[PDB]
Structures are given as C-alpha cells and as structure tokens.
C-alpha cells in the first residue's frame with residue numbers, strides 16, 4: 001500500500017481548490033524513485049468541466065480520496081509483479097487538475113476551477129526532497145494516458161527544478177505510457193462545435209488558454225505564441241527534450257482511435273493500417289520504445305503488464321535494458337516496435 005499525503009502547500013490544489021497530494025511507499029536504502037502521473041482525459045471549458053465534476057469528481061478533487069492505494073504493475077513492490085523496479089520508492093500522483101498536467105492557474109474571482117498540474121508535480125518533488133528524495137540517484141517520472149503526455153510536458157522541468165535546488169546528481173528520466181498521440185486526420189470529421197465534436201488539437205488549443213497551460217521551453221520557442229498545442233504531441237515535443245525518455249505506446253491506442261472517431265470494410269481497414277504505420281514511423285528514431293501492435297490503452301500500472309512482449313522481449317525486460325544502457329547490449333534491446341500491421345497480430349496482446 002501507498003499512503004496518502006496531502007500537499008503541505010495548500011495553495012497547490014485540485015480543480016475545486018481542495019489540496020492536491022501524492023501516495024507514497026518508501027523503500028529504505030533504495031536510491032531509485034518512481035513518480036507516476038495518473039491519466040484520465042481533461043476538460044477545457046466551464047460546461048465540460050462542470051460535467052466532469054458531477055461524475056468524475058475524484059479527477060477534480062481530493063475530498064473523497066482514500067487514505068491508501070495498492071501499488072500495481074510498475075508501482076508494485078513484489079518482484080513477481082514488478083521485475084523492473086520492485087524495490088524503488090513508489091509515488092502515485094493522482095490526476096486532479098484535468099489539464100494534461102500542464103496548468104498553472106489558481107481558482108480565483110475570474111476562474112471557477114484551478115488548473116495546477118504543472119505546479120502539482122513541482123510541489124510533490126519539493127516535498128519529497130525532505131522525505132528521502134534528496135538522496136536519490138534516479139528519479140523516473142512515469143505516467144499513463146494523459147499522464148504519459150504529462151511526462152513529456154514535465155520531465156525536463158523536474159530536471160531543471162532539481163538542478164536549481166542544488167541536486168545535480170539526481171538523474172531525471174521519463175517513462176511515457178499511452179501518451180504519444182498523432183494529430184492525424186479523423187476517420188469521420190466534425191467541426192469543433194461541442195465537446196464530442198472537438199478534435200484534440202482544437203480542444204488542447206482551447207484548454208491551454210483556459211488552464212494557463214505551460215509546455216517545455218525549447219518546444220515553446222520552436223512553435224511560439226498560439227501554437228503551444230503542438231507540444232502536446234509526442235513526435236513534436238520529444239526531439240526538444242534533454243532528459244532520457246522511454247516511450248510505451250500501443251500502435252492502435254484506444255484513446256487515439258476515439259479522437260479519430262473510430263468505433264471492417266476497406267476504407268476503415270486502410271485507415272487503421274495507416275494509423276499503425278504512422279505511429280511506427282514516429283518511433284523510428286526513438287531509441288527507447290516499446291510499441292506492440294495491439295488495440296488497447298495503458299500498460300505500466302496493470303497487474304499483468306509483464307505479459308506483453310515485442311520480438312520476444314517483455315516491457316519490464318526492456319526497461320531493465322534501458323537502465324543498463326544509461327550506466328548496444330547483447331540480447332538486451334531497448335527499441336521494440338512491432339512491424340505487423342493489424343491489431344492483435346502480436347499474440348501477446350491483452351485479451
């Protein structure tokens with residue numbers, strides 16, 4: 001079990017102004033720290049944030065959070081379930097800012113909701129430093145879905161924060177799971193007239209303004225004012241990052257298909273095959289990646305995350321090989337992208 005700590009800086013809040021927080025399980029003597037960002041979409045205007053507040057309130061508020069959570073998958077402390085980092089210090093950071101971890105805005109007379117995802121991460125890091133993180137050798141910022149995009153948006157800021165605080169020896173790395181999206185053509189098209197019809201590029205453009213969203217500095221400098229939404233797309237932001245980042249992405253991610261309006265005749269067959277080919281292409285020059293040809297969503301905190309393999313190598317093995325590479329390796333690969341073109345052409349895909 002990981003134990004809840006609400007942030008001592010109560011100005012760093014979830015959407016409704018309740019304190020943000022983190023769940024922690026320390027591992028005495030380990031100098032590895034895993035900070036995991038939860039996912040769960042986002043909201044981008046008053047109306048759709050209000051709807052999310054009614055039926056997804058745990059993603060907008062800490063008022064009903066339980067005192068503990070069980071660590072699963074990469075957050076498990078059992079080597080049977082987590083061959084990779086079972087002995088690490090484990091941190092689960094709940095997603096309660098609805099801003100893809102990008103926001104830097106407080107609730108105020110002008111703002112019904114606070115969007116503080118970028119500041120939540122910084123505050124968690126700050127408060128963990130007094131709880132043992134100061135002695136760390138590696139801080140792996142991991143995340144799934146919107147949390148995986150959050151890794152891409154925040155990993156270099158965590159590195160800069162620790163450098164400025166006087167901890168240049170902590171190696172900051174990122175693990176982005178299911179957060180590598182394409183701003184591709186939808187299978188069927190609708191103009192952005194409401195929440196359902198609004199494609200992510202336009203929803204994110206609106207969200208950035210609504211959240212006071214922030215993106216990594218080098219990416220911001222490339223795309224400039226009004227175009228920061230580009231930095232939410234992994235293939236565009238990744239080349240601007242300095243921290244080592246391992247990318248986990250199903251070739252046929254269910255969230256990608258959702259925003260593409262895909263729910264099989266020749267037109268759709270070709271669409272799906274082209275999606276997989278495009279995703280594969282974006283990963284060609286990503287040296288640490290794991291991209292199985294499956295229709296699914298998230299992997300790293302699932303209890304059976306050890307089951308899927310690409311070219312005979314599981315994700316926990318690939319992550320271990322990545323660790324070794326950061327000290328090519330014989331029989332210990334880190335770039336694992338399926339080449340077969342249809343979901344479940346890999347027999348190890350989740351059932």
Ligand SMILES: *[C@@H]1O[C@H](CO)[C@@H](O)[C@H](O)[C@H]1NC(C)=O
Nearest residue numbers: 009010011012119120122123
């Ligand atoms: C609390 O968090 C806010 C927002 O990130 C920050 O500006 C402020 O300096 C923090 N205060 C303390 C005492 O850490």
Ligand SMILES: O=C(O)CSc1ncccc1[N+](=O)[O-]
Nearest residue numbers: 039040041145146181200255
């Ligand atoms: O959290 C989830 O399940 C999905 S998040 C997502 N999905 C698709 C496109 C963009 C995003 N966003 O977060 O940048």
